[PDB]
Amino acid sequence: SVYITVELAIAVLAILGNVLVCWAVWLNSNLQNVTNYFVVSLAAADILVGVLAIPFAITISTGFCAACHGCLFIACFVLVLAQSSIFSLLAIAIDRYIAIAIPLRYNGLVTGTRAAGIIAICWVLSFAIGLTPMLGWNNCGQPGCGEGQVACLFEDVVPMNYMVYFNFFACVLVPLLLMLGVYLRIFAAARRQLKQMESQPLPGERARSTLQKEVHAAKSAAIIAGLFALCWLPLHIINCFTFFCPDCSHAPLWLMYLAIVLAHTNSVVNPFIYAYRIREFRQTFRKIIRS
């Protein structure tokens, strides 16, 4: 009853943290920028982890008996939240890049309306992908609970070929390679800006200060996505071993737990990274708690 205790502890924080982040945004209009529209998507997405994903994860750990639909949803629901975060993280990276690369067209292209539109699409795509095993790509009854109901065990009811090729390599690895690629251009060009402003016949500390702050946001964004791959790779890394190497010692249950748990942890690091990285955020939360 320790994995249960720890998982619960996480659930509370995930809820409190991101809910706080959502509230802070709702109160402080200085945080209601087009950029943070995606941050809320991250909040809602990661809140539901402690809300549902964690509850389900803890449940499916022991396994139960239910129909294929009901069993798949519970097993693949986590994929939706994890996939939605991908789009959010990617969008943010794009956003932070757009501003630095094209500050003038930033306001013309980055619209508070398009933000809401993209977010919606990301979620729709997240469900399609995250719940693709429900489209038929599953192992429900592949060579107890009785007819109709199936032993709901993640590894037994969810195809590995999907979790490796379609899910990881494509829906996770590729984006992370795109995101990382984006930040590459972000900082490379950002420092170029400073060099051009380094050879300017005028002070113009307004441009520098702004640029540095834009970079500070882009850097924070990088740290947010960085912690994502860092908390999910081990899990996929484990599965990559199990699949590509049937011979390779199948990951122990205890080690699998840790890797599984680490993924749930990511939802929590955000609220604290905002309070730490963003001086505007910390002061907002400080207000809420006190009052």
* DSSP character string of 240-260: HHHHH-SSS-PPPHHHHHHHH
Per-residue mark of binding to ligand T4G, 248-277 (x: CB under 6 A): ------------x--x--------------
Nearer CB in complex with ligand T4G: 96/264: 264
Question: How many of the chain's residues bind ligand T4G (CB under 6 A)?
Answer: 11
Three-state secondary structure string covering 165-185: HHHHHHHHHHHHHHHHHHHHH
Nearer CB in complex with ligand T4G: 44/163: 163
Contact yes or no for 116/51 (Cβ under 8 A): no
To the nearest 10 degrees (0 to 180), the angle between helices 205-244 and 253-277 is: 170
Among 235, 268, 269, 275, binds ligand T4G (CB under 6 A): 235
Give least dist CB 136 to ligand T4G, A. Answer: 19
Rule CB under 6 A: say whether 85 interacts with ligand T4G: no
Amino acid letter for position 155: E
Give least dist CB 15 to ligand T4G, A. Answer: 17
Nearer CB in complex with ligand T4G: 189/237: 237
Give least dist CB 228 to ligand T4G, A. Answer: 12
Collapsing DSSP to helix, strand or coil, 33 comes out as: coil
Give least dist CB 82 to ligand T4G, A. Answer: 6
240 burial via Cβ count (<10 Å: 0-12, 13-18, 19+): middle
| Helix (H) / strand (E) containing 150 | strand 150-152
- Which two structure tokens, joined as six digits, stand for 235? 């899990």
Nearer CB in complex with ligand T4G: 197/258: 258
Give residue number: closest CB to ligand T4G.
Answer: 263
Amino acid letter for position 248: C
Give least dist CB 57 to ligand T4G, A. Answer: 4
Rule CB under 6 A: say whether 36 interacts with ligand T4G: no
What's the DSSP call for residue 203? -
Rule CB under 6 A: say whether 60 interacts with ligand T4G: yes
Collapsing DSSP to helix, strand or coil, 29 comes out as: coil
Rule CB under 6 A: say whether 228 interacts with ligand T4G: no
User: What are the residues binding ligand T4G (CB under 6 A)?
Assistant: 57, 60, 78, 154-155, 163, 235-236, 239, 260, 263
